[PDB]
Design a protein around this ligand. Sequence first.
Ligand SMILES: *[C@@H]1O[C@H](CO)[C@@H](O[C@@H]2O[C@H](CO)[C@@H](O)[C@H](O)[C@H]2NC(C)=O)[C@H](O)[C@H]1NC(C)=O
Ligand SMILES: *[C@@H]1O[C@H](CO)[C@@H](O)[C@H](O)[C@H]1NC(C)=O
Ligand SMILES: *[C@@H]1O[C@H](CO)[C@@H](O)[C@H](O)[C@H]1NC(C)=O
Length: 286
Amino acid sequence: PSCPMLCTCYSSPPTVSCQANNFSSVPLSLPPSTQRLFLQNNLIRSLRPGTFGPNLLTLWLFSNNLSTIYPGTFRHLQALEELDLGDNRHLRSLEPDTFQGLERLQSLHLYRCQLSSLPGNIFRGLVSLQYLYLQENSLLHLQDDLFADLANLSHLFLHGNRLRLLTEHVFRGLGSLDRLLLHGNRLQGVHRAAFHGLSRLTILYLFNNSLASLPGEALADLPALEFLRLNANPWACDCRARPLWAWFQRARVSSSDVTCATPPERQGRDLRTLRDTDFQACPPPT
Ligand SMILES: *[C@@H]1O[C@H](CO)[C@@H](O[C@@H]2O[C@H](CO)[C@@H](O)[C@H](O)[C@H]2NC(C)=O)[C@H](O)[C@H]1NC(C)=O
Ligand SMILES: *[C@@H]1O[C@H](CO)[C@@H](O)[C@H](O)[C@H]1NC(C)=O
Ligand SMILES: *[C@@H]1O[C@H](CO)[C@@H](O)[C@H](O)[C@H]1NC(C)=O
């Protein structure tokens, strides 16, 4: 029973290389000892339970043609550490239990799959997860608590989606988060307490969104921040700018520029060029 048809197998570590065959399905006869399974660059259309063996540590399925993953498919891959499903442009939705079983998973790639939404409980129990790549789908919203079990998540990539708002508990439970990329969305509001608990976050990209302002509490909630990108937003340099401006007076972080789009008499200037006296007619903190 030695190697799937058209693939190459290696014994240390136990590896099955099946890439670039235009397969329409996962090959049969995978040796049960297989630890690494390379199926990228095929045309596989669906996955089912009974397909993958329990020893896999690494599974690459990117650039296939996945449109369906049937319930139970990953359920017995207790040992799996990396799962790459990126670049399956017709995949479109995932059932709530897709990743049930995957408690040792450390990185999960789901970029460019045309996801518009996710089930609110799809990432529950992924306690080992460290990297989660969701960039360049079409995600419209992220529910409160969508990442709540991910106490080890270090990088979360959410750029290039269609997000408009970050709600109060969207990032609840992300106490290890180090980098959060949100650029290239259409974000218009961030809840005051959206970054609560992100005490280890050092990098935050928000550039290229529709932000006119950000609350003071959100920046205050990032005590470890080191690099913040804010450019290519329509920043309002009026009373709304003051909590951000005040945070900039005290913060030690690298930053992009923060260019005012309004009012016209300040358009083009950097938000940090404003003076305390530009804010003297502003109602006191509310
Ligand atoms: C990639 O999978 C997609 C999505 O299932 C396939 O597009 C479909 O093609 C079939 C037959 O041509 C039609 O029933 C559908 O109208 C198409 N669906 C969608 C959503 O476009 C496409 O056939 C697949 N291509 C390959 C090369 O596997
Ligand atoms: C697979 O399919 C495409 C036809 O779309 C072809 O160009 C390519 O050479 C095929 N690749 C392999 C590796 O057999
Ligand atoms: C900004 O984001 C959109 C995705 O929302 C993208 O199409 C475009 O390439 C980016 N624009 C700039 C000016 O970088």
